[PDB]
Amino acid sequence: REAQEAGFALSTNGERLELTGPGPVPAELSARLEEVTLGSLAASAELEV
Amino acid sequence: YLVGPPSLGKHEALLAYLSTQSVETPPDLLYVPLSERKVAVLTLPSGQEIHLAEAVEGLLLEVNRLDELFRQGSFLREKTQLEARFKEAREQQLEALR
Amino acid sequence: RALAEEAAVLGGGLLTAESVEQAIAAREHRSFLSEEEFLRAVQEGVIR
Amino acid sequence: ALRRLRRDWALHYLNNRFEPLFQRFPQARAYLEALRARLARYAETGEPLDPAQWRPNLLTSSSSGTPPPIVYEPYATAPRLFGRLDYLVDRGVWSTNVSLIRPGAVHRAQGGYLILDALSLKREGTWEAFKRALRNGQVEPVTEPQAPAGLEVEPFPIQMQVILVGTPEAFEGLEEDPAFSELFRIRAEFSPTLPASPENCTALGGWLLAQGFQLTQGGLTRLYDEARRMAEQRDRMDARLVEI
Amino acid sequence: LDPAQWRPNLLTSSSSGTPPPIVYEPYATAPRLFGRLDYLVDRGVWSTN
């Protein structure tokens, strides 16, 4: 939803997430992307536990 | 230090007397590595050692997430930005030389 | 400080004059066994 | 610079991952910071991490405390007091880690009482190491000179009460050291003989009944008289209740 | 080239300057006073660095 509101397309690759668009994405958008990915992998670690 | 002639049952009373004593639940002490060379005895509130062990196993398994966080969009884009700046300086030098 | 700790224990948490006197008397008494036996022997006439 | 980022980002999210643990385990700041540093080093250099070298080595569990942990160690040797180090032999290399440290008598007496025999302390030559552990908190697990590398065990505040038990001559060779006086200050001196009185006769009868003996008044009286006989005094009875 | 042979070894880092490093060493054996050499055994070879 944030990527759609920002005018960018999300390109999922399995469990890996990245944002594709013309030029660099906004800094807050990149930070939110990194936080979402890190939360997903932390949830995966908790799933393993 | 209990002093007395032998066969006075000093040990037998002492244990009987100390059994009647009441102390606050002793903390769980455990050897924890502050490094691969240096280990310290740490005291935790009773019953918190099992949770600590579970969390430590979680952080040991966190090597997988450490490896995976180098394969995310933000890390890749920051890497590409760093490479782009380095090749920008490289290309400035290359164009001057050319 | 060790005698003060003993007085505090024997007075609960306060080192009054009675508490310190009790601590000193107990310190003397805990090693009084040989003297007590000697006095008992003197009284019973073993050591005249 | 790539290596620098591959520790910067790792530490940046490891702080967030460790904050809940820092909150839940306030005492373990040192160990958790060590784990964070080791994981940052893993992310930086890609240096393999051995799980066995980073484990909370439990020594004793307790939800009790009534009664307190009372550790009586009649055989007071260094391995039985301060613990012992196990080693794994890999390619002839003797290695050790936290998972190979076993508690001694000192370790399982924490928060309680450690009962030792002064004669044992003299005989095994562990009095020096034991008094060093009491005053300085230096409890060192027993190592062996065949291991190329050991473990640097940190000092530890001693939370136990040490209660020595022994015969007076077993303390004659131990009270010579001023450190014995400074450390052990309360003398629970035992009188070899009790006063000979009806109160002590009744106490002896009750003690024998608690031992499970079936007594008669004549039998208890005869045991009391024989206790006085063993004391070799008319007005004193023998306090050696094991003999009685 | 052996990288472990050519890396400066951190001994101790300054805490705050005040108070100064006050090292009380009650047990004064040579290993605890002058330090220790730890050896790595490779093929029965005790190598240090």
DSSP state letter for D75: S
Q: Is the dihedral of CA E27, E32, E34, E39 positive or negative?
A: positive
Q: How far is A14 from chain B (nearest CA, A)?
A: 11
**Chain B residues close to A18, C-beta within 8 Å:** 72-73, 76-77
**Chain B residues close to D42, C-beta within 8 Å:** 63, 66
Q: Which residues pair with D73 in a beta bridge?
A: D116
CB-closest option in D185, D187, D189 to C2: D185
Contact predicate D123/D169, CB 8 Å: no
Contact predicate B73/A33, CB 8 Å: yes
CB-closest option in B2, B27, B70 to D163: B2
CA terminus-to-terminus distance, chain C: 41
**Chain B residues close to D143, C-beta within 8 Å:** none
CA distances for B28 relative to A6, B7, B17, D112, D225, angstroms? 52, 36, 24, 12, 51
Q: How many H-runs (helices) and E-runs (strands) does chain A carry?
A: 2, 2
CA distances for D98 relative to B38, D51, D59, D83, D85, angstroms? 9, 11, 11, 12, 9
The residues near D211 (Cβ < 8 Å, ≥ 6 apart) are none
Q: How many CB pairs under 8 A join D and E?
A: 23
Closest to D89 (Cα-Cα) out of D140, D47, D144: D144
Structure method:
cryo-EM
**Chain D residues close to B19, C-beta within 8 Å:** 67, 70
E strand or H helix at E46: strand E45-47
Pairing of strands E40-42, E45-47: antiparallel
Resolution value (Å, 1 decimal): 3.0
* Subunit partners of chain C (3 or more CB pairs within 8 A): D
* Subunit partners of chain B (3 or more CB pairs within 8 A): A, D
User: D241 lies in which domain range?
Assistant: 197-244
